[PDB]
């Protein structure tokens, strides 16, 4: 909801809510954010392709 | 010799609000997970077992506490928490800021307990990082025992209800207190009670007969200050067991097994790690103590 | 030949306890210059070298075990061992000056007399170190009666791993280790770790995980279980490895022996003897450091674990049930 | 066809190589001094520790670095038609007849030892 | 039977100052950074009309 | 090493065998597939580099 | 002598390891600082105009 | 021989005529008990469909 | 043809040998290896 300059800042430095695991058999949610490098551009735009 | 220091990296600048609480409790014992210098903030809390949305179970939390390494704070910088470590068997300065305040002296004794009086007072929340930190409580052994006595008595008499003044109050010389039970998972507190039903009915099978006849001679007329539990009336059960004749070598074999099973009740009434204070300063609130994991 | 004698002048005077820190006050602040091992942060450079840090490597902790010296009949202590086995000292009465009885866990399997499938691997190996079992049972004529009243755990004192055995024909000398890591005799600069058979050891921390804390300390526990097989009293000794604290492991040991507790106490609906009620006892054989990998070995096969950096600290027997 | 239609939502993951551009002199860097700390001294070994501390500050106010998706390397998510079992997320909720609940759980459903096309992907039903 | 070769890797260090990544940065060696609590850089922007 | 940077899990081997098949069909007999392409030299040279 | 001098080669190469795994620590953290403040093109391009 | 109701869309994509896929490179190494559930167990769907 | 940890005077090469060693040794690229962690990574002693 906040101003879009803060949403540019928080987009890269904050892994957003409910991501998915990589490399493991099913889509689990990752709680260990020491390693995972995913960027999900579906929250800012609020779409589904 | 050895080094012991833990500096805790942290991903957001803390606010002045939560910096004031951490500065107020600058000497404080809290467990943490891994034994390294650099450490995430999600290990420093006791809140990995005691959360808000999950119902805490204080026995399991206390069961959790004897596994972990323990730590004392040194500084609270605005980015990083800096802590020192407690290892066997090392003398160390310990300084109580613990809010349900009790008085210590030289040659006292201590033990570490989960927060059992006021969770809101003993846990500060970090909205900056989203993870909350739970401090444990250090108690002398006499009240260290007497809280676990009242907590096991509670889970027996909450199951019978399937009121509060007898079940949730810890008694002590001069003060009375309130245990914090609103949402407790009793199931880890009941496997302890399941093993009490194992020992206590074995201890009812090997009762010595001469010690029961000693009470039938005692509590009827000989009234003592510490026998006021029975209120001057014999129980109906004690009259039923002493019908046999007394013989000495029968009770010799009974009192050895009575002796050996009271060695086993150490395992079910264990506190956490124990702290042997040899010197305590009064006006400075610091102490000196050697840590012993048992 | 004094060059041989000056070597002992070097090595004895270099290998002593550190002396007491005592400096006269008239010298002044020179005592603070003699506090070197308490200092624990050393400066690093752009390219540090051994010549930069030969002072940081010099200050070391003061560690020393306390050995035991045992003189054993060579019929009991089998002449070949893997040099790191754990020991016990059975004791009944001082009959002579110094003749001592020692029990390895493979020797204590044979006095037990339990079934083969309880420990399927060491039964073959302990039956070739010994006879049918009556080569050892003639020393203890009370093995039928110590198992009934339950006195057998009160007569064993856990001592620690082997260091050296000098073997003769009729008498075997055995030097074991208490209080810590015993120095290896034949290999220099080496440390004898403790070797357990894989059959006797029962691990306790094992999970899918399906999270538990790490620490500095994982403790090997011994156990000894009084039971009855073929309507005859017999014992069972197992080992346990966990760093969970003493309040959990007594609850974790009872879940392991749930079946054996039930099959015994079906008997005492008919006969209730108070001597029979004692069931087990648990000692503390000393600590292991966290995350040291137990290394599997095999000898003739007999699979045998080994633990690096095992330091010993004996405890009493406490009677669980 | 039952009385209702339904939509289905997936996810997808793409191993992507990236181009990171960074303009000149955008961060000021501060470099301390390394030290050696000795701890966890044991009988077989002695462990050391070499630590270093860094302060980094952003020189300018505008954005001075830009990342970009450049090259697709793989697709991991397999775009599978596996759907999510609500029996797994919500194991507490069940039907009143415990004999009928074990019937519907039979007719719908670590089980997979190997997967051929790729990492399996859960769907939903709205 | 014979030894024919006895071969081994050598790790050549790559300094940060000789990477070309350091062209995106400004590097100052600072002797006592453990003493510092907080750093601060302050901007004054005038805007003509 | 962009595929095996996570370690060869069960889901990396499947993504890697699914590229053994796709290169066996699309890029095979490459000097015979480039007799009938328009690029020609540019296809063989990127195949042979 | 060849036991001593082959053990001083161990402890240097165990300590050249310690410093040259810390120069990788610079190059890691400086690159990780850049990626926290690097928004993508599609967000930043229209804000650039 | 095959049921007359088998799909034609199986015969276009290159998989084996067993009816189930037989890729064993996908599953775990040296686990013979786990690689047999791919070939012959029908509690699971085949890894193709 | 046996592997042995004798303290040879190992020679130095220009080329790197580190690309895909974590997942080649574990999945069996080459027979007869041995991984050495920590204090084991040393040229131990000579005994003839």
- Assign 3-state DSSP to chain A and report helix, strand, coil percentages, each to 5: 20, 0, 80
CB C89 within 8 A of CB C156: yes
H15: nearest CA partner in chain F: F21
DSSP 8-state assignment for residue C192: P
CB-CB under 8 Å, F7 with I20: no
Closest CA to B122 of B30, B206, B252: B30
Residue C217: which H helix or E strand, with range? Answer: strand C217-229
CB D25 within 8 A of CB D59: yes
Distance CA C65, CA C87 (A): 16
CB C40 within 8 A of CB D37: yes
Contacts 24+ apart (CB under 8 A), G35-38: G35/A12, G35/D20, G35/D65, G35/D67, G36/A12, G36/A13, G37/A9, G37/A12, G37/A13, G37/D58, G37/D63, G37/D64, G37/D65, G38/A12, G38/D20, G38/D22, G38/D63, G38/D65, G38/D66, G38/D67
G12 → closest Cβ in C44, C46, C49: C49
Distance CA H22, CA F48 (A): 32
Residue-wise DSSP of B110-144: EEEE---S-HHHHEE--TTTS--EE--EEE-HHHH
Distance CA D33, CA E33 (A): 8
Contacts of H37 in chain D (CB under 8 A): 113
Structure tokens at B118: 């006021």
DSSP bridge pairs for E19: none
D46: nearest CA partner in chain I: I39
Residue-wise DSSP of C250-316: HHHHHHHTHHHHHHHHTGGGT---GGGG--EEEEEEEEEETTPPPPPEEE--EEE--BTT-B-----
Closest CA to E29 of D57, G27, G18, D55: D55
CB C312 within 8 A of CB C178: yes
Name every residue whose Cβ is closer than 8 Å to that of residue A48 and which is 6 or more positions away in sequence: A42, D9
Distance CA D26, CA H20 (A): 57
DSSP bridge pairs for C51: none
Is the preceding omega at residue C209 within 30 degrees of 0, hence cis?
A: yes
C162-167 and C171-178 strand pairing: antiparallel
Structure tokens at G49: 């105009």
Contacts of D46 in chain C (CB under 8 A): 60
Q: Which of the other chains make 3 or more beta carbon contacts under 8 angstroms with chain B?
A: C, D, E
Backbone φ, ψ for residue B253 (5° rounding): -75, -20
Q: Is H1 in CB contact (< 8 Å) with chain F?
A: no
Distance between E31 CA and the closest CA of chain G, angstroms? 16
Distance CA C83, CA F24 (A): 59
CB-CB under 8 Å, A38 with D122: no
Count how many Cα atoms sit within 13 Å of the Cα of residue C157 in the half-sphere of its side chain: 9
Contacts 24+ apart (CB under 8 A), C3-7: none
Structure tokens at C41: 């942060």
DSSP bridge pairs for C69: C175
Contacts of C52 in chain G (CB under 8 A): none
Distance CA C90, CA D1 (A): 81
Distance between F26 CA and the closest CA of chain D, angstroms? 16
Q: Is A6 in CB contact (< 8 Å) with chain D?
A: no
> Which SS3 state, helix, strand or coil, does residue C70 take?
strand
The dihedral of CA B205, B209, B211, B213: what is its sign? positive
Interface of G with E (CB under 8 A): 19-20, 23, 26-27, 30-31, 34
Contacts of A24 in chain F (CB under 8 A): 9, 11
Structure tokens at D73: 């390397």
CB C241 within 8 A of CB C265: no
Q: What angle do helix axes G23-36 and G8-20 make, rounded to 10 degrees?
A: 20
Q: Which residue has the tokens 């009160």?
A: C154
Structure tokens at C40: 């624990």
D45: nearest CA partner in chain I: I39
DSSP bridge pairs for G40: D67
Closest CA to B184 of B154, B153, B163: B154
CB C281 within 8 A of CB C153: yes
Distance between F12 CA and the closest CA of chain A, angstroms? 7
Q: CB-based burial of residue H33 (10 Å sphere; 0-12 exposed, 13-18 middle, 19+ buried)?
A: exposed
CB-CB under 8 Å, E11 with G20: yes
Distance between D113 CA and the closest CA of chain C, angstroms? 17
Cα–Cα distances (Å) from I48 to C127, E15, I6, in that order, read: 36, 43, 11
Closest CA to D43 of C192, C218, I42, C309: C309
The dihedral of CA I35, I37, I41, I44: what is its sign? negative
Residue C241: which H helix or E strand, with range? Answer: strand C232-242
Distance CA I37, CA H6 (A): 56
Distance CA A36, CA I17 (A): 27
CB B80 within 8 A of CB B12: no
Calculate the dihedral angle through the C-alpha atoms of D62, D65, D70, D72, rounding to the nearest 10 degrees. -110
CB B287 within 8 A of CB B281: yes
Tell me how crowded residue F4 is: count the other CB atoms within 10 A of its CB. Answer: 16
I40: nearest CA partner in chain D: D45
C213 → closest Cβ in B1, B2, B33: B33
Do chains A and C touch by CB distance (3+ pairs < 8 Å)? no
Resolution in A: 3.8
Q: CB-based burial of residue B206 (10 Å sphere; 0-12 exposed, 13-18 middle, 19+ buried)?
A: middle
Distance CA G48, CA G35 (A): 19
CB B43 within 8 A of CB B14: no
Beta strand spans in chain B (E) = 6-8, 29-32, 38-39, 69-76, 81-86, 91-92, 109-113, 123-124, 133-134, 137-139, 169-171, 176-178, 274-280, 287-292
> Which SS3 state, helix, strand or coil, does residue G14 take?
helix
CB C290 within 8 A of CB C214: yes
CB B132 within 8 A of CB B52: yes
> Which SS3 state, helix, strand or coil, does residue C76 take?
coil
Q: Which of the other chains make 3 or more beta carbon contacts under 8 angstroms with chain H?
A: D, F
CB C287 within 8 A of CB C313: yes
CB-CB under 8 Å, D38 with B37: no
CB C245 within 8 A of CB C215: no
F1: nearest CA partner in chain D: D73
Closest CA to C227 of C148, C134, C141: C148
């Amino acid at each position: 909801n906040r101003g879009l300059y803060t949403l540019v800042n928080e987009y890269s430095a904050r892994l957003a809510g409910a991501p998915a695991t990589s490399t493991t058999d099913l889509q689990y949610v990752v709680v260990n954010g020491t390693d995972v490098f995913l960027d999900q551009p579906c929250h800012m735009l609020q779409e589904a392709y | 010799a050895l080094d012991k220091s833990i500096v805790v990296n942290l991903t957001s600048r803390l606010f002045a609000d939560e910096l004031a609480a951490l500065q107020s409790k600058i000497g404080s014992v809290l467990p943490l997970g891994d034994c390294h210098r650099l450490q995430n903030i999600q290990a420093l809390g006791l809140g990995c077992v005691c959360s808000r949305e999950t119902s805490p179970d204080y026995i399991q939390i206390m069961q959790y506490l004897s596994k972990c390494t323990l730590a004392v704070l040194e500084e609270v910088r605005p980015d990083s928490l800096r802590l020192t470590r407690m290892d066997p068997s090392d003398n160390l300065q310990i300084k109580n800021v613990y809010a349900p305040f009790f008085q210590w002296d030289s040659n006292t004794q201590l033990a570490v307990l989960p927060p059992l009086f006021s969770r809101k007072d003993s846990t500060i929340v970090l909205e900056s990082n989203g993870f909350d930190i739970v401090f444990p409580m250090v108690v002398p052994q006499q009240l260290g025992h007497a809280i676990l006595q009242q907590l096991l008595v509670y889970h027996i008499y909450s199951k019978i209800s399937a009121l509060d003044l007898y079940t949730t109050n810890v008694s002590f010389m001069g003060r009375t207190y309130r245990l914090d039970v609103d949402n407790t998972d009793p199931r880890t507190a009941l496997r302890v009670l399941d093993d009490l039903s194992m020992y206590l009915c074995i201890l009812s099978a090997l009762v010595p007969r001469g010690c029961l006849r000693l009470l039938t001679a005692l509590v009827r007329h000989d009234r003592h200050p510490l026998t006021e539990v029975f209120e001057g009336v014999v129980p109906d059960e004690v009259t039923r067991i002493d019908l046999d004749q007394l013989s000495v070598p029968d009770d010799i074999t009974r009192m050895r097994v009575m002796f050996s099973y009271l060695q086993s009740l150490s395992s079910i009434f264990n506190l956490g790690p124990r702290l042997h204070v040899y010197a305590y300063s009064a006006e400075t609130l610091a102490a000196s103590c050697w840590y012993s994991p048992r | 030949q004094a060059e041989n004698a000056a070597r002992l002048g070097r090595q004895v005077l270099g290998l002593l306890p550190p002396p007491t820190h005592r400096v006269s006050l008239t010298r002044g602040p020179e005592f603070a210059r003699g506090v070197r091992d308490l200092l624990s942060k050393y400066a690093a450079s752009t390219r540090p070298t051994v010549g930069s840090l030969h002072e940081a490597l010099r200050q070391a902790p003061f560690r020393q075990p306390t050995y035991g010296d045992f003189l054993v009949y060579s019929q009991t202590f089998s002449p070949q061992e893997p040099l790191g086995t754990f020991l016990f000292s059975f004791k009944q009465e001082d009959n002579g000056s110094s003749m001592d009885m020692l029990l390895t866990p493979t020797s204590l399997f044979m006095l037990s007399g339990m079934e083969a499938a309880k420990a399927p691997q060491t039964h073959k190996v302990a039956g070739v170190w010994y006879g049918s079992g009556s080569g050892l049972a003639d020393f203890i004529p009370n093995l039928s009666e110590l198992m009934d009243t339950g006195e057998f755990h009160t007569l064993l004192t856990p001592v620690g791993p082997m260091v050296q055995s000098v073997h003769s024909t009729f008498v075997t000398k055995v030097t074991s280790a208490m209080k810590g890591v015993g120095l290896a005799r034949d290999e220099p600069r080496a440390h004898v770790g403790l070797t357990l058979p894989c059959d006797m050891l029962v691990d306790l921390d094992e999970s899918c995980p399906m999270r538990e804390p790490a620490g500095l300390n994982v403790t090997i526990y011994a156990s000894l279980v009084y039971l009855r097989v073929n309507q005859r009293p017999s014992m069972a000794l197992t080992f346990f490895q966990s760093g969970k604290g003493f309040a959990e492991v007594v609850a974790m040991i009872k879940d392991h022996f749930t079946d054996v507790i039930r099959t015994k106490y079906i008997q005492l609906r008919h006969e209730l003897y108070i001597n029979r009620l004692v069931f087990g006892a648990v000692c503390t054989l000393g600590t292991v450091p966290f995350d040291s990998h137990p290394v599997h070995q095999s000898l003739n096969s007999l699979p045998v674990l080994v633990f690096a950096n095992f330091e010993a600290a004996c405890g009493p027997w406490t009677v669980f049930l | 066809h039952p009385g209702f239609a339904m939509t289905v939502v997936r996810t997808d993951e793409v191993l992507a190589e990236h181009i990171l551009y960074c303009s000149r002199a955008s961060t000021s860097m501060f470099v301390g001094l390394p030290s050696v700390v000795r701890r966890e001294v044991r009988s077989d070994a002695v462990t050391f520790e070499i630590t270093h501390e860094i302060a980094s500050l952003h020189t300018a106010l505008g954005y001075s670095s830009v990342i970009a998706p450049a090259h697709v390397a793989a697709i991991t998510t397999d775009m599978g038609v596996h759907c999510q079992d609500l029996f797994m997320i919500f194991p507490g909720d069940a039907y009143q007849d415990r004999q009928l609940h074990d019937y519907i759980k039979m007719k719908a459903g670590e089980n997979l030892p190997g997967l051929s096309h790729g990492q399996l992907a859960t769907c939903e039903i709205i | 039977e014979a030894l024919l070769g006895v071969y081994t890797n050598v790790v050549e260090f790559v300094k940060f100052l000789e990477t070309a990544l350091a062209a995106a940065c400004v590097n100052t060696e600072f002797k006592d950074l453990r003493r510092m609590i907080d750093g601060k850089i302050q901007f004054k922007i005038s805007m003509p009309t | 090493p962009v595929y095996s940077e996570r370690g060869l899990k069960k889901a990396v081997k499947s993504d890697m065998v699914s590229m053994f098949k796709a290169h066996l069909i699309e890029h095979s007999f490459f000097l015979d597939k480039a007799e009938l392409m328009t690029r020609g030299k540019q296809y063989v040279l990127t195949m042979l580099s | 002598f060849t036991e001593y001098a082959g053990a001083i080669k161990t402890i240097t190469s165990a300590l050249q390891f310690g410093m040259d795994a810390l120069e990788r620590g610079l190059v890691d953290t400086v690159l990780a600082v850049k990626l926290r403040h690097a928004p993508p093109v599609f967000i930043l391009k229209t804000l650039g105009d | 021989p095959t049921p007359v109701t088998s799909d034609v869309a199986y015969f276009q994509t290159p998989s084996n005529p067993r009816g189930r896929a037989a890729c064993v490179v996908s599953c775990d190494a040296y686990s013979n008990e786990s690689a047999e559930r791919l070939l012959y167990d029908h509690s699971i769907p085949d890894p193709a469909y | 043809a046996t592997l042995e940890q004798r303290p040879f005077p190992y020679l130095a090469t220009e080329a790197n040998l580190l690309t895909q060693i974590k997942e080649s040794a574990a999945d069996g690229l080459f027979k007869s290896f041995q991984l050495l962690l920590g204090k084991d990574a040393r040229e131990g002693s000579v005994r003839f």
